[PDB]
Design a protein around this ligand. Sequence first.
Ligand SMILES: O=P(O)(O)OC[C@H]1O[C@](O)(COP(=O)(O)O)[C@@H](O)[C@@H]1O
Ligand SMILES: O=P(O)(O)OC[C@H]1O[C@](O)(COP(=O)(O)O)[C@@H](O)[C@@H]1O
Ligand SMILES: O=P(O)(O)OC[C@H]1O[C@](O)(COP(=O)(O)O)[C@@H](O)[C@@H]1O
Ligand SMILES: O=P(O)(O)OC[C@H]1O[C@](O)(COP(=O)(O)O)[C@@H](O)[C@@H]1O
Lengths: 396, 411, 408, 408
Amino acid sequence: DTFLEHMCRLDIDSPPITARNTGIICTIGPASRSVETLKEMIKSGMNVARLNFSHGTHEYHAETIKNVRTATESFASDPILYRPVAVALDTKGPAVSEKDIQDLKFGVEQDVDMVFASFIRKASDVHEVRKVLGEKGKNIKIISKIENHEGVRRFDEILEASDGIMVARGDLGIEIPAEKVFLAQKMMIGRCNRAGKPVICATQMLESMIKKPRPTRAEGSDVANAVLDGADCIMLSGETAKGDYPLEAVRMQHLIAREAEAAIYHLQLFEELRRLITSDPTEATAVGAVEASFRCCSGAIIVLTKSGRSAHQVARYRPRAPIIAVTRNPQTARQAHLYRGIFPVLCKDPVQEAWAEDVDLRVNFAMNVGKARGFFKKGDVVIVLTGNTMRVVPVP
Amino acid sequence: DTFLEHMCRLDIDSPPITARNTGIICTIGPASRSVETLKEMIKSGMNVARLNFSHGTHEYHAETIKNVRTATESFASDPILYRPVAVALDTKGPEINLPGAAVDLPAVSEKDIQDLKFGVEQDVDMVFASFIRKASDVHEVRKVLGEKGKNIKIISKIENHEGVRRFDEILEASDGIMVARGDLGIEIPAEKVFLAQKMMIGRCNRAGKPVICATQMLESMIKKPRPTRAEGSDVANAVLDGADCIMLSGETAKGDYPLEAVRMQHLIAREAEAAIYHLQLFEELRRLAPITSDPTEATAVGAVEASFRCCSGAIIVLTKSGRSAHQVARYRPRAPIIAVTRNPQTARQAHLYRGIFPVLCKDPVQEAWAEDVDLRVNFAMNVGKARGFFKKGDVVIVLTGTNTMRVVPVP
Amino acid sequence: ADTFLEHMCRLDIDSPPITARNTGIICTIGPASRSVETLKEMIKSGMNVARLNFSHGTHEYHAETIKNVRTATESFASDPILYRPVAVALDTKGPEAVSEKDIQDLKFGVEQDVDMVFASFIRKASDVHEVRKVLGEKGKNIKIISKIENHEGVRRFDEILEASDGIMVARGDLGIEIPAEKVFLAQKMMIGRCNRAGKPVICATQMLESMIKKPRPTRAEGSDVANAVLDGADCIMLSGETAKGDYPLEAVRMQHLIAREAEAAIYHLQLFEELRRLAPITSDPTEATAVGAVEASFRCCSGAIIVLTKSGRSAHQVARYRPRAPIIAVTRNPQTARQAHLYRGIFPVLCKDPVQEAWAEDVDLRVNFAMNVGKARGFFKKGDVVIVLTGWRPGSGFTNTMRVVPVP
Amino acid sequence: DTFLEHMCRLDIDSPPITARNTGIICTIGPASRSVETLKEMIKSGMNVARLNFSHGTHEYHAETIKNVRTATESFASDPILYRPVAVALDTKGPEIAVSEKDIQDLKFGVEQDVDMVFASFIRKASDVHEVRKVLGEKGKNIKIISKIENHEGVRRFDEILEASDGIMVARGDLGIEIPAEKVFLAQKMMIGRCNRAGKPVICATQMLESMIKKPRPTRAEGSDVANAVLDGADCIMLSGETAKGDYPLEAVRMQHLIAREAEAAIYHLQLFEELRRLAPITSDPTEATAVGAVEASFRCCSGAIIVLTKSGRSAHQVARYRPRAPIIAVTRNPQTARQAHLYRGIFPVLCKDPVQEAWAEDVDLRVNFAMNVGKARGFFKKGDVVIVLTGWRPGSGFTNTMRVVPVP
Ligand SMILES: O=P(O)(O)OC[C@H]1O[C@](O)(COP(=O)(O)O)[C@@H](O)[C@@H]1O
Ligand SMILES: O=P(O)(O)OC[C@H]1O[C@](O)(COP(=O)(O)O)[C@@H](O)[C@@H]1O
Ligand SMILES: O=P(O)(O)OC[C@H]1O[C@](O)(COP(=O)(O)O)[C@@H](O)[C@@H]1O
Ligand SMILES: O=P(O)(O)OC[C@H]1O[C@](O)(COP(=O)(O)O)[C@@H](O)[C@@H]1O
């Protein structure tokens, strides 16, 4: 009923009985480059494979991308259990260096799902990046890395221009005093949550685990707090790129994140967002869905989406219940990992000629997915969204 | 944002830009008995015709019922504009003077048993059961009506101390409550009466059951063409208290100005809608609402939430028994509820609930169910457009099954 | 009671009111209530303010009424512990800006030492200023209450309210000008704004009209009074009921019962909490002191908030935030003791004891006096916790001290 | 108005416009043992010197205590600027109720006149009682802080909390027993309950481990400290950082900076408002007085809440409700001045002036002393509004008076 009291009844004896809602982004390098390691990392919880173009050639990275996709499709046999895995391109940065311009285009042909643009100071910088990507890769999400003072002063215009934000504490603190950094992090996560755009907490997550099999406690709580701050994704850098224990870092990331979900006071964030008028049918539909979900404790909110946006709008209001976003578009299934609470699910079944049946096919597919992964059981109540349409149905 | 501010920013210069959500129940008698008067009263806003069986014969009342129905069906030509009109039977109840604070032991007077039986065959929509002291009394009334009238809504008149003390068990047993204020103050001190009224309206609102404010609404208008305002503000406060319906007695039954009383009732009620602080009541109910597990309930919740979220012109609900519309009205949306039904009784009974605008579809049942549903939806759409609830392009919420919510633009 | 709905739900007519009446009763005095012996009864029945309607009567007539009111009032002066202050109000005839007839009536009010003035047909701030100017330096400590009786008064209510010391909603004159469906809106609006601004508001005209000829009121009238109290009105007024009717005394006794009952239906938490949200933020020691006092009073369920005041103003500031606990305003100024009845919840108490040379002793004297007053009237008992407000200096405008003390 | 907005309006361009409210506890050892280093650490912000009795003899620690007090009293010349410094004794505890070794260390604590004791491996209330029993009537004024370091301690935290005067979350020992991912939950749980109960809680172990060998810390450590402050911790503790490391002085200066910054990110409205909702109705004058004071302080943005206290409890009760304004606790008891550092927001101030025979004057003396302290340290200036709390009678337990006064 109150935040204080919610903190008071936190029980370490009760295990987390929810899936992880925070996305895990892993930087891939020498340590994690191999197909067999990537397999295990996906099994460990990796959602997005980051490529750092500060070093390496196009040939090198292209082989990394090939391995990532090879490993990912090893599980394609079971579509029910198949885990979509996004591919992110992180630019070297300085407006837009001559070198970046080629990496972005390389990104386009390599069909990357998103782009981490470095050292963004203003909206015009994001536009230039948008321009460079052009019509060809306009469906590639642009995530603006804030790494300096001006970027902070002009965060609002940057956020609107971008599809998402990355808080790079490492680069931030070189520029700004270390004691000011955590303030910037909380500010940006807040505004991104307010604006309903994905935010990523990045750099120096579990630096200790480069040489060690377990992390410190200052790192363990920092990750958890980032999740509690409202971050959509958490990122591992050197931990998975070069370290001795890349696989342990992911498994630890998973454990901490899943635990941190319990400490989340869902009532507050949802209710505060409600406090802050539309005319968009889909939006009003998403609102009703999230409201209903709290009132009947739904196992999940099943959403049929093509571009991902309808699921994104549901995630905006931050339901407790997991969002099962059903899509046949493999890119949107991969991009969905940027948003907290969305569990993307790729339907490989053939398009049924009868549209009503084809919709029912994708719904029941999600239903099977939910039961298998332990989201709900037969008899549980779930909400299904289709198109402007909300539906409260029992699980078959 | 706060209740104080809402009252402060009330502007009498700005006219009410909403329809009346409170039901008007008119007692019918000598003054309003004629078909031509009833016609006018329906156009003036009468929703429910009450019959007082304290006086009159079965022959007399039967003639009243015939006139009411005759007048009502004069508008049946246009189903788009047709306004359902309920028929209520108010029983005489057990009599003796009155003994304050005592526990009495009649139940259902011999005279009532005959009136209720008359009600069933006359096909009355609801019954105002007099002098209810306990749940067992409501059960006897339910049993007396039997299988014959199981669909007749029973409204329990609280008129004494014991009834108040045992209100909770009475409310659960009943389909609705009538605060018969007139009889209350005879039993209980006049200064205690307003407390009882507010208590009972509160609990009925909490329980999602219709409550009626009754007796001496506008007594002055029996002889006068306008009422006092002490009566006018009393009506307004009853509306603000949360009453679903307001009732005229002698005002329309015997008085010189029965038609003026209804038009005045309409004006005051419609005005009082503006003074309603909708956010509070809606939010307090959200807060008091338990976790359900009922699909239909969860559907109604999302609908009301959404309606606030997009300022919907209306919440269109397809219903058979009225129940689905009732569940939506429970959470008290600002937007009017257009309850679409083919059951004419359900269309008439809907007037007991605040905010529900019942609408009777007379179109034939289409063999294709999807088409038949769309037919009733578009019917409501024409219904909304005609009465000025919304226009083409406006956003409205449509409920169907019952588990489905839909946010659609007006054709 | 976490919600307003539940508060209404938990209303019990079986449980009797265990609070004093906080709403003031203003009685119009005329032929029926003129006699000293009747006035006694009305004071014993609960009358707080005697209104004089200058629509009719001569100065000779009214002057004797004032003499009658004061004679009856001072009959109880023997016991200062139980003495009930009784205000004298002058209600002007008004234009049928300021009619010449009013100009002499106001001056007459000054000479007669009236506590307040009900100014009729106020349309704007300049009207209130004219009334203020007319009263002049002579009686500038007389509270001006602006009667809103028309549309323009309603449209320009805000400028009128600041200029005035209080507001009177005259539904009777209102309903003539404005439609029989719009006043209750006007009534609630004006009471709201007066509550927001911390200025006394009075509900007037057609309170219990039935009781002119009848020994009992109607059912519509009883709830109308109750709702006015629940709306937030500081005072309720009887007109013909007490002026000419057959049962002026029964009207007061009924007014008292209804008002006392309506106190139970008040959801104190809301109004107090809503004012906290809207309170600006100050730097006035006296204001901050009052806030803490009202807060403390809720947090420890105080029997009363005892306030030493000279002009009444400090007690007014406590009442602004609407505590549940009664405010015992201790004063030696007899005028302010009479004027205090304009404010809901303030129980004025007149100390007649001589001024002690030691100021600390004089303060303690007035405090213990209130303590005895509280015990006598059944506000609290020995051992109960009460809040006492005082200042650091023997002057007015310096109350900065809050004290949580047990009842001796 | 909302938590989201408050986070959104965080501005790194605006420097912190507050003093540090979180206490800094420094473990003292070889690196920080010298009088001249301790001097610097006090100037850097050290409030409490911890002694780890896992190693070392009574001889060793006794000299440490002597140096701590020597360094502390070097500033005693100016009482206005004098900074009280507490002395904490951290027991070794049972290894694999109260070990035979601890019993001697605790008695050693009594003779050395330690201000508080960190009791290790507390599993239950009986353990805290045993520690209290051992300390006996001798040291009954020594605060007992129960170190939670295992599964059972967590499970039975509530009974432990009531028995103790405070709690220490020893994360280091916690994660050995419980999974590292479960710990932050335990930390937040215990800090919450201590905040709820108004008892001091300490975040301990592995604050800035990196600063043992490095001149600056990592960011995972920097944000961990900040979050502990935001969680609601009253004190933060440095261990090896100041005990043995190469940069003990840099650790304190860094601790201070992070803590001061984290104060800005605190959403004071929420915690204060949530506590009043959960606050029970109390008949204690001192409690109601503290409530009114904190309310007033928010309502007038007070520079400080000045509290005259003897045993410390009255300042503790004000801090319970978590005001934004700093609490200046005035006392002549040097132990309570040292113990005050356990509570967030309390700035203890030791009056060395002689006791005036006139008590009213003696009270005024201590008040103006706090006023000078506040002006000097930049808490407020002449003219600012501050809240002053005092009592009606000398001795402990009688503070019932709140006063809103301007700064001379
Ligand atoms: O989230 P998006 O990209 O707006 O797409 C939502 C669409 O998906 C659907 O659920 C299914 O549409 P398709 O069968 O064409 O994929 C539609 O109801 C709706 O228009
Ligand atoms: O309101 P009720 O009595 O529960 O019935 C609601 C019914 O109305 C409908 O919307 C229409 O069904 P019908 O074709 O029988 O009229 C159904 O979806 C639902 O079963
Ligand atoms: O309500 P007012 O007009 O401010 O009067 C309050 C004043 O009364 C006092 O309590 C005492 O004043 P007096 O001794 O002159 O009556 C002061 O502390 C305070 O300034
Ligand atoms: O916090 P504590 O221990 O109750 O001390 C509060 C005491 O301090 C005082 O303000 C001053 O008393 P002393 O002269 O003994 O210091 C008393 O009024 C009050 O009883």
